[PDB]
Amino acid sequence: PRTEISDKITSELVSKIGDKNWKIRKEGLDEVAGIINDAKFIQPNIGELPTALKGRLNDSNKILVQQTLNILQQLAVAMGPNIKQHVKNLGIPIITVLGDSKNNVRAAALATVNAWAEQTGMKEWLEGEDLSEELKKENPFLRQELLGWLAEKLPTLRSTPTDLILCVPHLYSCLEDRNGDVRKKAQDALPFFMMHLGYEKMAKATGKLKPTSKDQVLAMLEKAKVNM
């Protein structure tokens, strides 16, 4: 079977990963990468590792954010579909890294959520309020990347996205975002939202907008109704 590595996740190791000295944090993360690669395939119980890694997704040293993202990629491949058990606790915090100002860090975060989605499908990622609460944030890097990801994943869903409607008010915010790339990605995503929600549901959601915003969004909606 797969190897259980929970007993490798010791108090000593978790303590190193959270140390105040980056060299000791790095030593801890280096060890974790080695443990997973040597096991190759692992059981889903990874002790307190998720708490330790969540704590490094905003490390002051960007190389340790990158190292943590690579370890999260290892975990998806090594654990397989059982990594679904960790999506809400550990996967969603990866989404916040799409808001990094460093292009190479954002790129690694996107690759990481895609590596997980290959194992888990998109259902857990789109369920409930968690993703919409990230899209809500006025970070143009986060909005851009998340809208791009939605446009790519929405036509491939194996389960109806129950809570896609929760993203809609923030999608509409993005249609008028200050950032032009955000506006472009929101426009790209619009028809893929509509394929699941339908026009009337999306048109109803414009009620909460100010009259000027409501007017432009409805016009964008009419045009996407061509592709229906």
JSON list of C-alpha atoms in Angstrom, two decimals:
[
{"chain": "A", "resi": 1, "resn": "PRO", "atom": "CA", "xyz": [0.00, 0.00, 0.00]},
{"chain": "A", "resi": 2, "resn": "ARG", "atom": "CA", "xyz": [0.95, 3.66, 0.25]},
{"chain": "A", "resi": 3, "resn": "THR", "atom": "CA", "xyz": [3.38, 4.57, 3.05]},
{"chain": "A", "resi": 4, "resn": "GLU", "atom": "CA", "xyz": [2.08, 6.25, 6.22]},
{"chain": "A", "resi": 5, "resn": "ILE", "atom": "CA", "xyz": [4.34, 9.23, 7.01]},
{"chain": "A", "resi": 6, "resn": "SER", "atom": "CA", "xyz": [2.44, 10.68, 9.97]},
{"chain": "A", "resi": 7, "resn": "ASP", "atom": "CA", "xyz": [5.10, 9.50, 12.44]},
{"chain": "A", "resi": 8, "resn": "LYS", "atom": "CA", "xyz": [7.76, 11.36, 10.43]},
{"chain": "A", "resi": 9, "resn": "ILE", "atom": "CA", "xyz": [5.91, 14.59, 11.16]},
{"chain": "A", "resi": 10, "resn": "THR", "atom": "CA", "xyz": [7.41, 15.04, 14.62]},
{"chain": "A", "resi": 11, "resn": "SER", "atom": "CA", "xyz": [7.20, 17.83, 17.17]},
{"chain": "A", "resi": 12, "resn": "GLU", "atom": "CA", "xyz": [10.84, 18.56, 16.26]},
{"chain": "A", "resi": 13, "resn": "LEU", "atom": "CA", "xyz": [10.05, 18.84, 12.56]},
{"chain": "A", "resi": 14, "resn": "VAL", "atom": "CA", "xyz": [6.94, 21.01, 13.00]},
{"chain": "A", "resi": 15, "resn": "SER", "atom": "CA", "xyz": [8.90, 23.23, 15.39]},
{"chain": "A", "resi": 16, "resn": "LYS", "atom": "CA", "xyz": [11.67, 23.73, 12.81]},
{"chain": "A", "resi": 17, "resn": "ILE", "atom": "CA", "xyz": [9.22, 24.66, 10.04]},
{"chain": "A", "resi": 18, "resn": "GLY", "atom": "CA", "xyz": [7.82, 27.43, 12.28]},
{"chain": "A", "resi": 19, "resn": "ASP", "atom": "CA", "xyz": [11.18, 28.68, 13.62]},
{"chain": "A", "resi": 20, "resn": "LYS", "atom": "CA", "xyz": [12.01, 32.41, 13.61]},
{"chain": "A", "resi": 21, "resn": "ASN", "atom": "CA", "xyz": [15.22, 31.74, 11.62]},
{"chain": "A", "resi": 22, "resn": "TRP", "atom": "CA", "xyz": [14.57, 31.15, 7.88]},
{"chain": "A", "resi": 23, "resn": "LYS", "atom": "CA", "xyz": [17.50, 28.75, 7.62]},
{"chain": "A", "resi": 24, "resn": "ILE", "atom": "CA", "xyz": [15.87, 26.46, 10.16]},
{"chain": "A", "resi": 25, "resn": "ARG", "atom": "CA", "xyz": [12.46, 26.77, 8.48]},
{"chain": "A", "resi": 26, "resn": "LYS", "atom": "CA", "xyz": [14.14, 25.83, 5.20]},
{"chain": "A", "resi": 27, "resn": "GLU", "atom": "CA", "xyz": [15.87, 22.84, 6.79]},
{"chain": "A", "resi": 28, "resn": "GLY", "atom": "CA", "xyz": [12.45, 21.64, 7.97]},
{"chain": "A", "resi": 29, "resn": "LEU", "atom": "CA", "xyz": [10.85, 22.10, 4.54]},
{"chain": "A", "resi": 30, "resn": "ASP", "atom": "CA", "xyz": [13.82, 20.43, 2.81]},
{"chain": "A", "resi": 31, "resn": "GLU", "atom": "CA", "xyz": [13.33, 17.41, 5.07]},
{"chain": "A", "resi": 32, "resn": "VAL", "atom": "CA", "xyz": [9.60, 17.22, 4.30]},
{"chain": "A", "resi": 33, "resn": "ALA", "atom": "CA", "xyz": [10.28, 17.27, 0.53]},
{"chain": "A", "resi": 34, "resn": "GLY", "atom": "CA", "xyz": [12.72, 14.39, 0.95]},
{"chain": "A", "resi": 35, "resn": "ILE", "atom": "CA", "xyz": [10.33, 12.33, 3.08]},
{"chain": "A", "resi": 36, "resn": "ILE", "atom": "CA", "xyz": [7.54, 12.52, 0.49]},
{"chain": "A", "resi": 37, "resn": "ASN", "atom": "CA", "xyz": [9.80, 11.85, -2.51]},
{"chain": "A", "resi": 38, "resn": "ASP", "atom": "CA", "xyz": [11.32, 8.79, -0.78]},
{"chain": "A", "resi": 39, "resn": "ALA", "atom": "CA", "xyz": [7.87, 7.37, 0.11]},
{"chain": "A", "resi": 40, "resn": "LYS", "atom": "CA", "xyz": [6.65, 8.19, -3.43]},
{"chain": "A", "resi": 41, "resn": "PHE", "atom": "CA", "xyz": [3.05, 7.41, -2.46]},
{"chain": "A", "resi": 42, "resn": "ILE", "atom": "CA", "xyz": [1.54, 8.23, 0.92]},
{"chain": "A", "resi": 43, "resn": "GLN", "atom": "CA", "xyz": [-1.51, 7.66, 3.15]},
{"chain": "A", "resi": 44, "resn": "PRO", "atom": "CA", "xyz": [-3.78, 10.65, 3.87]},
{"chain": "A", "resi": 45, "resn": "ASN", "atom": "CA", "xyz": [-2.80, 11.08, 7.55]},
{"chain": "A", "resi": 46, "resn": "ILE", "atom": "CA", "xyz": [0.03, 13.62, 7.49]},
{"chain": "A", "resi": 47, "resn": "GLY", "atom": "CA", "xyz": [-0.10, 14.59, 11.17]},
{"chain": "A", "resi": 48, "resn": "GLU", "atom": "CA", "xyz": [0.25, 18.31, 11.84]},
{"chain": "A", "resi": 49, "resn": "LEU", "atom": "CA", "xyz": [1.89, 18.99, 8.46]},
{"chain": "A", "resi": 50, "resn": "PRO", "atom": "CA", "xyz": [-1.08, 20.93, 7.07]},
{"chain": "A", "resi": 51, "resn": "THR", "atom": "CA", "xyz": [-0.90, 23.47, 9.92]},
{"chain": "A", "resi": 52, "resn": "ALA", "atom": "CA", "xyz": [2.85, 23.83, 9.47]},
{"chain": "A", "resi": 53, "resn": "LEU", "atom": "CA", "xyz": [2.62, 24.37, 5.70]},
{"chain": "A", "resi": 54, "resn": "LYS", "atom": "CA", "xyz": [-0.31, 26.81, 5.92]},
{"chain": "A", "resi": 55, "resn": "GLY", "atom": "CA", "xyz": [1.92, 28.88, 8.14]},
{"chain": "A", "resi": 56, "resn": "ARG", "atom": "CA", "xyz": [4.57, 29.14, 5.40]},
{"chain": "A", "resi": 57, "resn": "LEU", "atom": "CA", "xyz": [2.29, 30.25, 2.55]},
{"chain": "A", "resi": 58, "resn": "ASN", "atom": "CA", "xyz": [3.05, 33.82, 3.64]},
{"chain": "A", "resi": 59, "resn": "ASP", "atom": "CA", "xyz": [6.67, 33.34, 4.63]},
{"chain": "A", "resi": 60, "resn": "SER", "atom": "CA", "xyz": [8.75, 36.54, 4.64]},
{"chain": "A", "resi": 61, "resn": "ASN", "atom": "CA", "xyz": [11.29, 34.68, 2.48]},
{"chain": "A", "resi": 62, "resn": "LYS", "atom": "CA", "xyz": [9.69, 34.09, -0.92]},
{"chain": "A", "resi": 63, "resn": "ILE", "atom": "CA", "xyz": [11.84, 31.02, -1.65]},
{"chain": "A", "resi": 64, "resn": "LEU", "atom": "CA", "xyz": [10.10, 29.29, 1.25]},
{"chain": "A", "resi": 65, "resn": "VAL", "atom": "CA", "xyz": [6.68, 30.14, -0.18]},
{"chain": "A", "resi": 66, "resn": "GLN", "atom": "CA", "xyz": [7.90, 28.55, -3.43]},
{"chain": "A", "resi": 67, "resn": "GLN", "atom": "CA", "xyz": [9.29, 25.53, -1.58]},
{"chain": "A", "resi": 68, "resn": "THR", "atom": "CA", "xyz": [5.98, 25.11, 0.25]},
{"chain": "A", "resi": 69, "resn": "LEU", "atom": "CA", "xyz": [4.07, 25.23, -3.04]},
{"chain": "A", "resi": 70, "resn": "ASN", "atom": "CA", "xyz": [6.35, 22.54, -4.50]},
{"chain": "A", "resi": 71, "resn": "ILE", "atom": "CA", "xyz": [5.75, 20.35, -1.42]},
{"chain": "A", "resi": 72, "resn": "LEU", "atom": "CA", "xyz": [2.00, 20.87, -1.84]},
{"chain": "A", "resi": 73, "resn": "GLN", "atom": "CA", "xyz": [2.40, 19.64, -5.45]},
{"chain": "A", "resi": 74, "resn": "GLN", "atom": "CA", "xyz": [4.31, 16.58, -4.20]},
{"chain": "A", "resi": 75, "resn": "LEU", "atom": "CA", "xyz": [1.52, 15.90, -1.72]},
{"chain": "A", "resi": 76, "resn": "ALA", "atom": "CA", "xyz": [-1.18, 15.84, -4.40]},
{"chain": "A", "resi": 77, "resn": "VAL", "atom": "CA", "xyz": [0.73, 13.37, -6.57]},
{"chain": "A", "resi": 78, "resn": "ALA", "atom": "CA", "xyz": [1.91, 11.23, -3.62]},
{"chain": "A", "resi": 79, "resn": "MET", "atom": "CA", "xyz": [-1.47, 11.11, -1.85]},
{"chain": "A", "resi": 80, "resn": "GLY", "atom": "CA", "xyz": [-3.69, 10.94, -4.95]},
{"chain": "A", "resi": 81, "resn": "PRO", "atom": "CA", "xyz": [-7.46, 11.63, -4.72]},
{"chain": "A", "resi": 82, "resn": "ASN", "atom": "CA", "xyz": [-7.40, 11.29, -0.91]},
{"chain": "A", "resi": 83, "resn": "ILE", "atom": "CA", "xyz": [-5.90, 14.79, -0.94]},
{"chain": "A", "resi": 84, "resn": "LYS", "atom": "CA", "xyz": [-9.57, 15.89, -1.19]},
{"chain": "A", "resi": 85, "resn": "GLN", "atom": "CA", "xyz": [-9.65, 15.58, 2.62]},
{"chain": "A", "resi": 86, "resn": "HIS", "atom": "CA", "xyz": [-7.27, 18.53, 2.82]},
{"chain": "A", "resi": 87, "resn": "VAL", "atom": "CA", "xyz": [-8.86, 20.91, 0.29]},
{"chain": "A", "resi": 88, "resn": "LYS", "atom": "CA", "xyz": [-10.84, 23.16, 2.63]},
{"chain": "A", "resi": 89, "resn": "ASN", "atom": "CA", "xyz": [-8.15, 23.43, 5.31]},
{"chain": "A", "resi": 90, "resn": "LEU", "atom": "CA", "xyz": [-5.00, 23.51, 3.18]},
{"chain": "A", "resi": 91, "resn": "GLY", "atom": "CA", "xyz": [-6.05, 23.90, -0.47]},
{"chain": "A", "resi": 92, "resn": "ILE", "atom": "CA", "xyz": [-8.02, 27.14, -0.19]},
{"chain": "A", "resi": 93, "resn": "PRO", "atom": "CA", "xyz": [-5.11, 28.98, 1.49]},
{"chain": "A", "resi": 94, "resn": "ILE", "atom": "CA", "xyz": [-3.13, 28.24, -1.70]},
{"chain": "A", "resi": 95, "resn": "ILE", "atom": "CA", "xyz": [-5.62, 30.44, -3.58]},
{"chain": "A", "resi": 96, "resn": "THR", "atom": "CA", "xyz": [-4.52, 33.48, -1.58]},
{"chain": "A", "resi": 97, "resn": "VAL", "atom": "CA", "xyz": [-1.01, 33.02, -3.05]},
{"chain": "A", "resi": 98, "resn": "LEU", "atom": "CA", "xyz": [-2.44, 33.88, -6.49]},
{"chain": "A", "resi": 99, "resn": "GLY", "atom": "CA", "xyz": [-2.42, 37.42, -5.06]},
{"chain": "A", "resi": 100, "resn": "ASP", "atom": "CA", "xyz": [1.36, 37.50, -4.80]},
{"chain": "A", "resi": 101, "resn": "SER", "atom": "CA", "xyz": [2.99, 40.49, -6.48]},
{"chain": "A", "resi": 102, "resn": "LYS", "atom": "CA", "xyz": [5.81, 38.24, -7.76]},
{"chain": "A", "resi": 103, "resn": "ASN", "atom": "CA", "xyz": [4.95, 36.71, -11.14]},
{"chain": "A", "resi": 104, "resn": "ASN", "atom": "CA", "xyz": [6.92, 33.53, -10.50]},
{"chain": "A", "resi": 105, "resn": "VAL", "atom": "CA", "xyz": [5.22, 32.94, -7.15]},
{"chain": "A", "resi": 106, "resn": "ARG", "atom": "CA", "xyz": [1.75, 33.46, -8.68]},
{"chain": "A", "resi": 107, "resn": "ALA", "atom": "CA", "xyz": [2.64, 31.08, -11.47]},
{"chain": "A", "resi": 108, "resn": "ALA", "atom": "CA", "xyz": [3.65, 28.38, -8.97]},
{"chain": "A", "resi": 109, "resn": "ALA", "atom": "CA", "xyz": [0.45, 28.83, -6.94]},
{"chain": "A", "resi": 110, "resn": "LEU", "atom": "CA", "xyz": [-1.69, 28.39, -10.08]},
{"chain": "A", "resi": 111, "resn": "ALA", "atom": "CA", "xyz": [0.29, 25.29, -11.01]},
{"chain": "A", "resi": 112, "resn": "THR", "atom": "CA", "xyz": [-0.29, 24.01, -7.48]},
{"chain": "A", "resi": 113, "resn": "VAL", "atom": "CA", "xyz": [-4.07, 24.39, -7.46]},
{"chain": "A", "resi": 114, "resn": "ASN", "atom": "CA", "xyz": [-4.10, 22.74, -10.91]},
{"chain": "A", "resi": 115, "resn": "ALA", "atom": "CA", "xyz": [-2.01, 19.84, -9.57]},
{"chain": "A", "resi": 116, "resn": "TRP", "atom": "CA", "xyz": [-4.54, 19.34, -6.77]},
{"chain": "A", "resi": 117, "resn": "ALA", "atom": "CA", "xyz": [-7.53, 19.66, -9.11]},
{"chain": "A", "resi": 118, "resn": "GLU", "atom": "CA", "xyz": [-6.11, 16.83, -11.24]},
{"chain": "A", "resi": 119, "resn": "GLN", "atom": "CA", "xyz": [-6.57, 14.61, -8.17]},
{"chain": "A", "resi": 120, "resn": "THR", "atom": "CA", "xyz": [-9.69, 16.11, -6.58]},
{"chain": "A", "resi": 121, "resn": "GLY", "atom": "CA", "xyz": [-11.84, 17.53, -9.35]},
{"chain": "A", "resi": 122, "resn": "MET", "atom": "CA", "xyz": [-13.22, 21.05, -8.97]},
{"chain": "A", "resi": 123, "resn": "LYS", "atom": "CA", "xyz": [-16.23, 20.27, -6.78]},
{"chain": "A", "resi": 124, "resn": "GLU", "atom": "CA", "xyz": [-14.71, 21.05, -3.38]},
{"chain": "A", "resi": 125, "resn": "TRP", "atom": "CA", "xyz": [-12.95, 24.13, -4.74]},
{"chain": "A", "resi": 126, "resn": "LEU", "atom": "CA", "xyz": [-16.23, 25.69, -5.94]},
{"chain": "A", "resi": 127, "resn": "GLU", "atom": "CA", "xyz": [-18.48, 24.57, -3.05]},
{"chain": "A", "resi": 128, "resn": "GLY", "atom": "CA", "xyz": [-19.65, 27.00, -0.39]},
{"chain": "A", "resi": 129, "resn": "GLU", "atom": "CA", "xyz": [-18.35, 30.50, 0.31]},
{"chain": "A", "resi": 130, "resn": "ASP", "atom": "CA", "xyz": [-14.58, 29.91, 0.37]},
{"chain": "A", "resi": 131, "resn": "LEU", "atom": "CA", "xyz": [-13.64, 30.77, -3.22]},
{"chain": "A", "resi": 132, "resn": "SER", "atom": "CA", "xyz": [-16.06, 33.69, -3.52]},
{"chain": "A", "resi": 133, "resn": "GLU", "atom": "CA", "xyz": [-14.48, 35.21, -0.39]},
{"chain": "A", "resi": 134, "resn": "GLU", "atom": "CA", "xyz": [-11.11, 35.20, -2.20]},
{"chain": "A", "resi": 135, "resn": "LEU", "atom": "CA", "xyz": [-12.53, 36.70, -5.41]},
{"chain": "A", "resi": 136, "resn": "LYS", "atom": "CA", "xyz": [-14.09, 39.43, -3.29]},
{"chain": "A", "resi": 137, "resn": "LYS", "atom": "CA", "xyz": [-10.65, 40.70, -2.29]},
{"chain": "A", "resi": 138, "resn": "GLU", "atom": "CA", "xyz": [-9.54, 43.83, -4.16]},
{"chain": "A", "resi": 139, "resn": "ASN", "atom": "CA", "xyz": [-6.24, 42.31, -5.23]},
{"chain": "A", "resi": 140, "resn": "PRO", "atom": "CA", "xyz": [-5.86, 42.59, -9.01]},
{"chain": "A", "resi": 141, "resn": "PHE", "atom": "CA", "xyz": [-3.37, 39.72, -9.27]},
{"chain": "A", "resi": 142, "resn": "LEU", "atom": "CA", "xyz": [-5.69, 37.39, -7.33]},
{"chain": "A", "resi": 143, "resn": "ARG", "atom": "CA", "xyz": [-8.77, 38.40, -9.35]},
{"chain": "A", "resi": 144, "resn": "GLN", "atom": "CA", "xyz": [-6.95, 38.02, -12.67]},
{"chain": "A", "resi": 145, "resn": "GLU", "atom": "CA", "xyz": [-5.64, 34.55, -11.96]},
{"chain": "A", "resi": 146, "resn": "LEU", "atom": "CA", "xyz": [-8.79, 33.26, -10.32]},
{"chain": "A", "resi": 147, "resn": "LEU", "atom": "CA", "xyz": [-10.99, 34.45, -13.22]},
{"chain": "A", "resi": 148, "resn": "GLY", "atom": "CA", "xyz": [-8.60, 32.84, -15.68]},
{"chain": "A", "resi": 149, "resn": "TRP", "atom": "CA", "xyz": [-8.81, 29.59, -13.72]},
{"chain": "A", "resi": 150, "resn": "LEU", "atom": "CA", "xyz": [-12.62, 29.71, -13.68]},
{"chain": "A", "resi": 151, "resn": "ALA", "atom": "CA", "xyz": [-12.82, 30.28, -17.45]},
{"chain": "A", "resi": 152, "resn": "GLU", "atom": "CA", "xyz": [-10.60, 27.25, -18.02]},
{"chain": "A", "resi": 153, "resn": "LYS", "atom": "CA", "xyz": [-12.28, 24.90, -15.49]},
{"chain": "A", "resi": 154, "resn": "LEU", "atom": "CA", "xyz": [-16.00, 25.78, -15.78]},
{"chain": "A", "resi": 155, "resn": "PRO", "atom": "CA", "xyz": [-16.63, 23.90, -19.04]},
{"chain": "A", "resi": 156, "resn": "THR", "atom": "CA", "xyz": [-15.01, 20.73, -17.62]},
{"chain": "A", "resi": 157, "resn": "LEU", "atom": "CA", "xyz": [-16.94, 20.27, -14.36]},
{"chain": "A", "resi": 158, "resn": "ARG", "atom": "CA", "xyz": [-18.18, 16.77, -13.54]},
{"chain": "A", "resi": 159, "resn": "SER", "atom": "CA", "xyz": [-20.63, 18.05, -10.92]},
{"chain": "A", "resi": 160, "resn": "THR", "atom": "CA", "xyz": [-22.98, 21.04, -11.10]},
{"chain": "A", "resi": 161, "resn": "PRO", "atom": "CA", "xyz": [-21.31, 23.95, -9.32]},
{"chain": "A", "resi": 162, "resn": "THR", "atom": "CA", "xyz": [-23.95, 24.43, -6.58]},
{"chain": "A", "resi": 163, "resn": "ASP", "atom": "CA", "xyz": [-22.59, 27.73, -5.29]},
{"chain": "A", "resi": 164, "resn": "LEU", "atom": "CA", "xyz": [-21.29, 29.46, -8.43]},
{"chain": "A", "resi": 165, "resn": "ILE", "atom": "CA", "xyz": [-23.91, 32.13, -7.75]},
{"chain": "A", "resi": 166, "resn": "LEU", "atom": "CA", "xyz": [-21.91, 33.31, -4.71]},
{"chain": "A", "resi": 167, "resn": "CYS", "atom": "CA", "xyz": [-19.08, 34.42, -7.02]},
{"chain": "A", "resi": 168, "resn": "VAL", "atom": "CA", "xyz": [-21.40, 36.51, -9.19]},
{"chain": "A", "resi": 169, "resn": "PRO", "atom": "CA", "xyz": [-21.38, 39.80, -7.26]},
{"chain": "A", "resi": 170, "resn": "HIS", "atom": "CA", "xyz": [-17.57, 39.75, -7.34]},
{"chain": "A", "resi": 171, "resn": "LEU", "atom": "CA", "xyz": [-17.50, 38.77, -11.00]},
{"chain": "A", "resi": 172, "resn": "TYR", "atom": "CA", "xyz": [-19.53, 41.92, -11.63]},
{"chain": "A", "resi": 173, "resn": "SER", "atom": "CA", "xyz": [-17.05, 43.95, -9.54]},
{"chain": "A", "resi": 174, "resn": "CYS", "atom": "CA", "xyz": [-14.28, 42.54, -11.72]},
{"chain": "A", "resi": 175, "resn": "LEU", "atom": "CA", "xyz": [-16.09, 43.58, -14.93]},
{"chain": "A", "resi": 176, "resn": "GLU", "atom": "CA", "xyz": [-15.49, 47.18, -13.77]},
{"chain": "A", "resi": 177, "resn": "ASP", "atom": "CA", "xyz": [-12.15, 46.58, -12.07]},
{"chain": "A", "resi": 178, "resn": "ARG", "atom": "CA", "xyz": [-9.43, 49.21, -12.26]},
{"chain": "A", "resi": 179, "resn": "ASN", "atom": "CA", "xyz": [-7.12, 46.59, -13.75]},
{"chain": "A", "resi": 180, "resn": "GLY", "atom": "CA", "xyz": [-7.64, 45.98, -17.48]},
{"chain": "A", "resi": 181, "resn": "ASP", "atom": "CA", "xyz": [-6.42, 42.39, -17.32]},
{"chain": "A", "resi": 182, "resn": "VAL", "atom": "CA", "xyz": [-9.00, 41.75, -14.60]},
{"chain": "A", "resi": 183, "resn": "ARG", "atom": "CA", "xyz": [-11.75, 43.21, -16.81]},
{"chain": "A", "resi": 184, "resn": "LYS", "atom": "CA", "xyz": [-10.60, 41.07, -19.73]},
{"chain": "A", "resi": 185, "resn": "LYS", "atom": "CA", "xyz": [-10.57, 37.86, -17.69]},
{"chain": "A", "resi": 186, "resn": "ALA", "atom": "CA", "xyz": [-13.99, 38.69, -16.23]},
{"chain": "A", "resi": 187, "resn": "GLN", "atom": "CA", "xyz": [-15.38, 39.18, -19.73]},
{"chain": "A", "resi": 188, "resn": "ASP", "atom": "CA", "xyz": [-13.77, 35.87, -20.77]},
{"chain": "A", "resi": 189, "resn": "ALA", "atom": "CA", "xyz": [-15.42, 34.09, -17.81]},
{"chain": "A", "resi": 190, "resn": "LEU", "atom": "CA", "xyz": [-18.92, 35.54, -18.28]},
{"chain": "A", "resi": 191, "resn": "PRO", "atom": "CA", "xyz": [-20.24, 33.04, -20.86]},
{"chain": "A", "resi": 192, "resn": "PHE", "atom": "CA", "xyz": [-18.87, 30.13, -18.81]},
{"chain": "A", "resi": 193, "resn": "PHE", "atom": "CA", "xyz": [-20.77, 31.37, -15.77]},
{"chain": "A", "resi": 194, "resn": "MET", "atom": "CA", "xyz": [-23.88, 31.76, -17.92]},
{"chain": "A", "resi": 195, "resn": "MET", "atom": "CA", "xyz": [-23.68, 28.18, -19.22]},
{"chain": "A", "resi": 196, "resn": "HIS", "atom": "CA", "xyz": [-24.28, 27.00, -15.63]},
{"chain": "A", "resi": 197, "resn": "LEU", "atom": "CA", "xyz": [-26.47, 29.77, -14.19]},
{"chain": "A", "resi": 198, "resn": "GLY", "atom": "CA", "xyz": [-28.42, 30.82, -17.26]},
{"chain": "A", "resi": 199, "resn": "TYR", "atom": "CA", "xyz": [-29.16, 34.41, -18.30]},
{"chain": "A", "resi": 200, "resn": "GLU", "atom": "CA", "xyz": [-32.15, 35.16, -16.02]},
{"chain": "A", "resi": 201, "resn": "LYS", "atom": "CA", "xyz": [-30.31, 34.19, -12.82]},
{"chain": "A", "resi": 202, "resn": "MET", "atom": "CA", "xyz": [-27.36, 36.40, -13.75]},
{"chain": "A", "resi": 203, "resn": "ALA", "atom": "CA", "xyz": [-29.64, 39.26, -14.82]},
{"chain": "A", "resi": 204, "resn": "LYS", "atom": "CA", "xyz": [-31.49, 39.04, -11.49]},
{"chain": "A", "resi": 205, "resn": "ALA", "atom": "CA", "xyz": [-28.14, 39.33, -9.70]},
{"chain": "A", "resi": 206, "resn": "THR", "atom": "CA", "xyz": [-27.57, 42.79, -11.24]},
{"chain": "A", "resi": 207, "resn": "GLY", "atom": "CA", "xyz": [-30.31, 44.18, -8.99]},
{"chain": "A", "resi": 208, "resn": "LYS", "atom": "CA", "xyz": [-27.77, 44.65, -6.20]},
{"chain": "A", "resi": 209, "resn": "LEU", "atom": "CA", "xyz": [-25.69, 46.95, -8.45]},
{"chain": "A", "resi": 210, "resn": "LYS", "atom": "CA", "xyz": [-25.82, 50.73, -8.84]},
{"chain": "A", "resi": 211, "resn": "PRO", "atom": "CA", "xyz": [-27.86, 51.80, -11.94]},
{"chain": "A", "resi": 212, "resn": "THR", "atom": "CA", "xyz": [-24.80, 52.72, -14.00]},
{"chain": "A", "resi": 213, "resn": "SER", "atom": "CA", "xyz": [-23.03, 49.44, -13.21]},
{"chain": "A", "resi": 214, "resn": "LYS", "atom": "CA", "xyz": [-26.26, 47.49, -13.63]},
{"chain": "A", "resi": 215, "resn": "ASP", "atom": "CA", "xyz": [-26.60, 48.98, -17.10]},
{"chain": "A", "resi": 216, "resn": "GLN", "atom": "CA", "xyz": [-23.17, 47.97, -18.40]},
{"chain": "A", "resi": 217, "resn": "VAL", "atom": "CA", "xyz": [-23.29, 44.47, -16.90]},
{"chain": "A", "resi": 218, "resn": "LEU", "atom": "CA", "xyz": [-26.72, 43.73, -18.44]},
{"chain": "A", "resi": 219, "resn": "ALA", "atom": "CA", "xyz": [-25.31, 44.78, -21.82]},
{"chain": "A", "resi": 220, "resn": "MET", "atom": "CA", "xyz": [-22.35, 42.43, -21.36]},
{"chain": "A", "resi": 221, "resn": "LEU", "atom": "CA", "xyz": [-24.85, 39.71, -20.38]},
{"chain": "A", "resi": 222, "resn": "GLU", "atom": "CA", "xyz": [-26.93, 40.18, -23.57]},
{"chain": "A", "resi": 223, "resn": "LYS", "atom": "CA", "xyz": [-23.85, 39.64, -25.72]},
{"chain": "A", "resi": 224, "resn": "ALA", "atom": "CA", "xyz": [-22.84, 36.45, -23.88]},
{"chain": "A", "resi": 225, "resn": "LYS", "atom": "CA", "xyz": [-26.39, 35.15, -24.44]},
{"chain": "A", "resi": 226, "resn": "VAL", "atom": "CA", "xyz": [-25.33, 34.85, -28.08]},
{"chain": "A", "resi": 227, "resn": "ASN", "atom": "CA", "xyz": [-23.10, 31.92, -27.09]},
{"chain": "A", "resi": 228, "resn": "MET", "atom": "CA", "xyz": [-26.02, 30.16, -25.36]}
]
